[PDB]
Amino acid sequence: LTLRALERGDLRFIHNLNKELEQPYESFDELEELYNKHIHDNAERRFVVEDAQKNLIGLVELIEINYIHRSAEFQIIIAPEHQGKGFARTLINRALDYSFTILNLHKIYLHVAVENPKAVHLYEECGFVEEGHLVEEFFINGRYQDVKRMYILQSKYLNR
Amino acid sequence: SQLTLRALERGDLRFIHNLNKELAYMEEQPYESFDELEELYNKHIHDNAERRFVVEDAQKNLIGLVELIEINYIHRSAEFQIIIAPEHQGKGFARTLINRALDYSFTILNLHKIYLHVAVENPKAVHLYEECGFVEEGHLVEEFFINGRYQDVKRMYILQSKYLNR
Amino acid sequence: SQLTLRALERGDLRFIHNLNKELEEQPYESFDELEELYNKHIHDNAERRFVVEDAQKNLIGLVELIEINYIHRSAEFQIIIAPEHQGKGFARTLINRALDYSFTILNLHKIYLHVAVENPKAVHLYEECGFVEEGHLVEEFFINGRYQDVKRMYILQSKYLNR
Amino acid sequence: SQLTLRALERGDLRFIHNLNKELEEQPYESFDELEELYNKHIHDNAERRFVVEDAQKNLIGLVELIEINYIHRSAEFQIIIAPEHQGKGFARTLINRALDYSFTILNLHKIYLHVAVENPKAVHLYEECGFVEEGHLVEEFFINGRYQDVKRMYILQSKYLNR
Amino acid sequence: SQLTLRALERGDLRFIHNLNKELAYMEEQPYESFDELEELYNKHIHDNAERRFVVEDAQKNLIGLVELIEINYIHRSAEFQIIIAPEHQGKGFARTLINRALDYSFTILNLHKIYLHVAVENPKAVHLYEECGFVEEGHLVEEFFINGRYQDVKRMYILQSKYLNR
Amino acid sequence: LTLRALERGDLRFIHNLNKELEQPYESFDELEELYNKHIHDNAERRFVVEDAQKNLIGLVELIEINYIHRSAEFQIIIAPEHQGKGFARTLINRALDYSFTILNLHKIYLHVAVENPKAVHLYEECGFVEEGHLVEEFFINGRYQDVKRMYILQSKYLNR
Amino acid sequence: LTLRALERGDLRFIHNLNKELEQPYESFDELEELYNKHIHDNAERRFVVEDAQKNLIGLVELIEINYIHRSAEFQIIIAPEHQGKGFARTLINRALDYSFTILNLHKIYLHVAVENPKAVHLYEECGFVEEGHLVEEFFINGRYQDVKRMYILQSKYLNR
Amino acid sequence: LTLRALERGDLRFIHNLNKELEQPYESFDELEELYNKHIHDNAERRFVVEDAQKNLIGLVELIEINYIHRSAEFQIIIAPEHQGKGFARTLINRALDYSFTILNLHKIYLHVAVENPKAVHLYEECGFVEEGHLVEEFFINGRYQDVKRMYILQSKYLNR
Amino acid sequence: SQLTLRALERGDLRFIHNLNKELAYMEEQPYESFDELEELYNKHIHDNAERRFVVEDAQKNLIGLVELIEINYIHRSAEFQIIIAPEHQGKGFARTLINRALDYSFTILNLHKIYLHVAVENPKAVHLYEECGFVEEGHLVEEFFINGRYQDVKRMYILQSKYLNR
Amino acid sequence: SQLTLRALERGDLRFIHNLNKELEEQPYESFDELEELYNKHIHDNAERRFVVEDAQKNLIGLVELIEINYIHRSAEFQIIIAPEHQGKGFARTLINRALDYSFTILNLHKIYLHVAVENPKAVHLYEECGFVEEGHLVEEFFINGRYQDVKRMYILQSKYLNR
Amino acid sequence: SQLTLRALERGDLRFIHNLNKELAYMEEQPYESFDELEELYNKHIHDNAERRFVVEDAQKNLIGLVELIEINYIHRSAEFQIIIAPEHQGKGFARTLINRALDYSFTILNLHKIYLHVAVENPKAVHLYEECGFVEEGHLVEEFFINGRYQDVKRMYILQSKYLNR
Amino acid sequence: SQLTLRALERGDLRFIHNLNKELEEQPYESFDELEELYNKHIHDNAERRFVVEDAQKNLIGLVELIEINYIHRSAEFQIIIAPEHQGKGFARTLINRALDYSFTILNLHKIYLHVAVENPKAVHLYEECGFVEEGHLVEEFFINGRYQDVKRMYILQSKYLNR
């Protein structure tokens, strides 16, 4: 599985990929114009993961890149077809590899719903550690829910 | 739930234009130009004060349109509008799309109040929204000029709390 | 009749341009000027340009409302019928179709129009359609190498709604 | 009274900004946003913002018409009086001054407005000025850490002109 | 002829704004914003379809305004408008400025017809224009909404040939 | 033969038509962009003359339209194929008909090389009269040449 | 002490106010142009606190306003002259009052350096509660430092 | 008397100077904006004539400059104060001097009302010769009038 | 005269780009990007200070290019440049296109002087222009850097009077 | 060899993008950023980007000159060879082709470049091509999760022209 | 530490222009136009790749300028430049402003490496930077053309780790 | 002399405009054209316009470099001296000041200029300043109603640096 930069040609597929069960209700024209607005935005990175047969496995994103503090929020989404194939670990470390060996970032953090303990333990297996329990951070499905903020530092990923 | 909501996009504007030409019809200007419709659409792609959703079935046959306009994020309110093609008006899709819109308004968009305007001389629509949980909060006197005469319209609402509590 | 009032859009300008060549400067208007001027008035709420067609999508004519005031609730009505259907009897149909839109939808109070004094049959046709002379504009327009008079005829909303 | 209805212009925004600080988000609005938003609506025919003042150029209040439709001929009326003249009895004067403009100049058919249900004296004042309740909007606005109800009251042109 | 016509310019807009606030007054919107007046002026500086002239006396005391709008260069027609400050309305300047405008229209601008609209309920203005050579060509029924009622207005004209021939 | 307004679609043909023996050396891109600049120019009129089978006979133009003086310069060009067919008279009066009966102009003038006495007499047959002999007005083919300025008024054309 | 919206006229004072011991090294022209860019930005609020004699006490800011989740980050800065006068509590609740009674927000969170336990306890007195301990979040004075993320909800502030 | 290029500072004076007995009825804002539009217009020249005490005597203009035919229309206007002082001859030859010795033009022509025989003879004294009698060219004071088109060539002015 | 001059246009830019890649070659930057060539062309469509002409035969086979740059309309001067594809360099088209350009410069554009620059180390071109009427007016020392060394170039001219008089 | 130095144009960006994916951030660069950044530098006289290809139009590599000063007449030279032809011996050919353009056409005085200290064979190849070490930049770039040193090597016009 | 760093702003450009006219002077173009300086400044107000700081004393007497250019946020590097008015060049302010810039680079901006270029024929500056912790990493041969001859320049650096560890 | 070479900026255009009125079209150039053309070339690296002044800020003249190539490293030098100091002996000073900038700062290779053949003293002055005739342009410029010849004189960097 390779890590490629997302380009305008991939927007149609991710638009249908977002439709899972905010983003599912986004107009494609808004998605495209917003993509055009962030072409040169150095504060974000949008990568599409594909296999040898150029099949879109998922999307890994880095947002809120600071460069002074050298931190960035991490996000990942895998198409329903490839959820249970065990790609998550590979894509996570693939994004951490780019963040710590190429972009030279110091910290990578992410948010996960407290009501998804399987996802929490997954990131724990990839090296992430809980640093916060945000109370009623996001309003998800008719109710406010807590989310875990988990992080991992450059030194730890490099000294595995 | 065999129908699906989907964000309106440029490719559907031609369908919307032909759809707005109804005779059943509370539609003010079915005599709008497609170019005015398209350009006005382009001006509201990033308008976070509205949400327009196309309704389509399993085979992607565009059924109708559901809209949330005048979205105020301090008062957590928004006006609701819905139109269904005359071909499927009798198949009972309305109350499904009404409840689907309310679900998005109250569970995703986190709105507090959803209101709508209905012509008093359309009791079929009034009683329908009542079944879907809407309650009358106003009887606007001579609010809209419709077919050569001023007519009254009901303003009806539904609150987030009531919807999220059976 | 089984005619419909559709909004003029860019896709019809080509047919309108060829139709404008009748026997105004419009017959001698470049299509590029017609299209660019159309684009400039797409959001001009002071005008309305509707294409009238039958069930077979055949363009019968073009009805227009201009100089819409919205305070005085008046507007100038103009009409043109394709040379093919000029004497078929659609004029009265499209006229009452334009008055129906003006008085039952746009909620206007007065619809006026100009008719060449040198066209008595046209003046008397509008009178049969409810219009009434309110002015005899002397040498208002220069038409065919000669200044001509035009009748200004009007119709009020109350009169049309209480037929 | 000897009050006059003047058009709000850029030269008054500073006074309006200080006046907006009462006890809406307007009290907490940056003047730069007020001025730039004013510039964007200079040609917005769907709104009217008039400054009401006396013979001595003293600003008594600000009357506004918004959501003007021109097809339905309706508009929302809003009013604010400077804290100095709130209990002096100008409210009824400026209200009938706004209805005079709406019904004798702009030729509107209906003027409606929202009044907090928690302000009975205000609701009954508009009723004395000819308005009538047509709606009781439940939890329409979030005011002072609490959703409040508002009365929607209207007045028709025919009623105001035949006093 | 002690008065002088002069092309309107930005510096006179403030006077025009205060002037339009008349009570004598056929002025539709004396409640216009000075900013709307100024910006609309800037948009018509090169509009060859209008001519706006400020009237001033020997000491450059701006008396009023004379306008030619809707100038059509194929039909050689234009609408005429005039306003005089309430201070000098009774000094008979009107017929002087009316004939001065007609002179510019027919001897300089080379127009063929000059028309104007007058409220039927203002006979003082109607008979005044008649004296200046204007003739009635129309009695427009309920043309303008004025002070809570639709009112008729006279449309009156004068031709270049008649003016240039005593 | 009908009188039609020139549109962007006719530019390619007139570009080749101009190549006869200034304009012959004009870039098509300049011709098109200049045409775009004068779409709404009320001071000029560009008409293409065509037959029943929509064949471009020539081009008649009105430039320097004043509207105060109600004058305009007249120009005409016929493709080499239709020069000797006697269309010139028809197109000239066709342009005069539009100028005097539709556009309501007062005077129509034109310039013709003094070394083209056949063209001078042609316009004399169509009603034009010499009003000037401009000395060395234009530099044509390596030498300055005189041109006749000929005119015709609205009253004369209407009272034939 | 009143809460007023920051306007272009106050930029010069806050520029000197920022100079305390990132922002202290910002060009005034950048500060002004960035202020012009966020005039209509509904995702932030910039308020200046002033006393009865219109003296700039400090600045309270709300950023990252969501409106769907109804959360926003809170920031406050008091001029060195008025630090020890005990205004912090008033300004904090003044900003919470605007967020919960006017803007109708649900959650207000903030970040404080773990090496500032006095500030932590202050927000604890104003109703804030720790929800996270971000490890090496910010690089402050030649070293990465931890910060506490503290929050307070609308229901709690209203039901005091 | 010196020949200076007209700049925006002189617009107010010429505006009042134009008011004599089209231009007298021009708005100053139109005059200024039109001046701004022709700053770099190489097809025209606008010169103001002034005396030793920098008093605006008049204005001489060259318009319709061709550069291929090397022709240009000449125009002159003297303030009423200096009409009878005999400056016209000087300013005329001053403009001809610039046209033939600096701008390297070939022909200079002008239009004069036939009902101004004194002006016609003046240009005849300065070297101009009648080349046309334009019938009813301009509509002046309620009637169409004829005008003389008079010219003078570069070789003649240089070989005086 | 079987060849024909024709105004350069966008459609010929690709040919010009491939043509400029000569090895025979006094062409400074044959390593120019087609996009730079096209955009620079778009910026000079209305530049009246240059004239670029494509040369084509009866079958419209683009032979080469003839240019007039630095056209000054006060001094009536312009620089002349010409390039012929290596395929037809030996067929003697040069002196035909040189005389065709001079004809346009002196009989149509009405220029007074046409000059050009030639590398001293290209006597074939120098003597060719001499035959076409050009005369040397300067031997510019180390004017251009060409292939790792500064080289001299001849500046040669021809006047309108001489050309128009056999 | 029978290679040619062609100017990089928009038609090649797609091939370059796929070629940039080697084993810099360029492999992870969106094509839209590559194309828009290319458009912004079409007229940037401080850079040169040439495509090197053979007679069969096969892209062998890409030579670049950046930071061109024109007062100091210096520029940084960069080179990349397609993975297919990396060990075929084109490196020395394209290097001397870039020096020929810099010194015999653009008339530059000095050409420098950076070479990873962890690539001795590369440093010694440039030395064989006439370059000479003038700097050992300590921890200049962060490459592969580690700050690496780079040799800065230069070559003067006079030396290349007098081989 | 009586001096203070402060972000450059438009009001100081005139001082910078007069300051750049040095004779002591490694300044390439002291013949730059103030308008070019001002417009170039306006184009880099939001350029996060540079940091320009004006130095002033207690009484706000602008002493000199300190710059960080070519700031790369992946490699955490930046070039350092400094200029002090000839009036205070001998008062030893340099090493204070050098260490103040390094402090901002390593403790606030969190940079990893700070390098600079110095003319070999200015040993006073070379040895000064050495005292401030800079170390030579390159002797660039004929790097800059200075006063009619190509001259060498030292490239010297200092790392964040060394600076933050006594 | 104690003269200095300063960059021409907008603040001097007024003085330059009055100075341009000497005995080119510049004397007859509108100041607005001078200022707007100046703005368009503020970042034009192909030109240089320096004001030469003494210690008392008195403008002695204006030296200019145009048509700067940077590949061929050539440029046209132009000079003008205020009528007040034309015969005072500053010409040779400003000429060598312009050559010093061209050859010791901008690193140009050749400086050429045009001198009217009808001004022998000027041609011989440049020859004394190191220039040499390389062309006799026949009827290059139309000056004072007559086409005049101009000498094109040059000077190389190597010659000026090795005086």
Numbering used by the authors:
A (entry chain C), F (entry chain C), G (entry chain C), H (entry chain C): 5 to 25, 33 to 171
B (entry chain B), E (entry chain B), I (entry chain B), K (entry chain B): 3 to 26, 30 to 171
C (entry chain A), D (entry chain A), J (entry chain A), L (entry chain A): 3 to 25, 32 to 171
Provide the authors' original text about this structure:
Spermidine/spermine N-acetyltransferases (SSATs) are catabolic enzymes that acetylate polyamines and are critical for maintaining intracellular polyamine homeostasis. SpeG is an SSAT protein found in a variety of bacteria, including the human pathogen Vibrio cholerae. This protein adopts a dodecameric structure and contains an allosteric site, making it unique compared to other SSATs. The allosteric site is located between monomers that form the hexamers of the dodecamer, and some evidence has been provided that shows when polyamine binds to these sites, the dodecamer tightens.
